[PDB]
Amino acid sequence: NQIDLNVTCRYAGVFHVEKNGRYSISRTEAADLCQAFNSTLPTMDQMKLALSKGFETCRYGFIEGNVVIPRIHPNAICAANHTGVYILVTSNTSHYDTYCFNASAPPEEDCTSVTDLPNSFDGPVTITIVNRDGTRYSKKGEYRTHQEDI
Numbered sequence: 001n002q003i004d005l006n007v008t009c010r011y012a013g014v015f016h017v018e019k020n021g022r023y024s025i026s027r028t029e030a031a032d033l034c035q036a037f038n039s040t041l042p043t044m045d046q047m048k049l050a051l052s053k054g055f056e057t058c059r060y061g062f063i064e065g066n067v068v069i070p071r072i073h074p075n076a077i078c079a080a081n082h083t084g085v086y087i088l089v090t091s092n093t094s095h096y097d098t099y100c101f102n103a104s105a106p107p108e109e110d111c112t113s114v115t116d117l118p119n120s121f122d123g124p125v126t127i128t129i130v131n132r133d134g135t136r137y138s139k140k141g142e143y144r145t146h147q148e149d150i
């Protein structure tokens, strides 16, 4: 009973979370997951400021109201070579990664590692935060409040 959460640097408090190395998060789960990091889904304005500070990924993830990819450099296989916050328009499917926003993070680029999951609740899952540099933090708990996401 394990969940791996790969996380990135924070940029103006915004970061990317990928679960179990695949697109596997629903919109309801995404809000619960950010809540476990004392965070919320980013607004489009928060994501645009994060982008301006250096944030880019090559993965679709939820923000408030849309599923997006922040892009700085044009890459043919990342959001069809687009730059800026690329918004997903047409998809058959519902599960993606998520972005999260922590208001207490530093204002610009923070590439220190994440060492805690501060607001998870009691439960039976071994949740492991995996940083880009390989460092890990694990704790027994749960963050999903909707039965259909479990």
Ligand SMILES: COC(=O)[C@@H]1[C@H](C)CCCN1S(C)(=O)=O
Pocket: 010, 015, 037, 038, 039, 102, 104, 105, 106, 113, 114, 115, 116, 117, 118
């Ligand atoms: C340092 O910035 C943070 O608040 C991060 C993260 C953005 C949310 C979750 C807790 N942490 S932490 C103390 O690294 O584990």
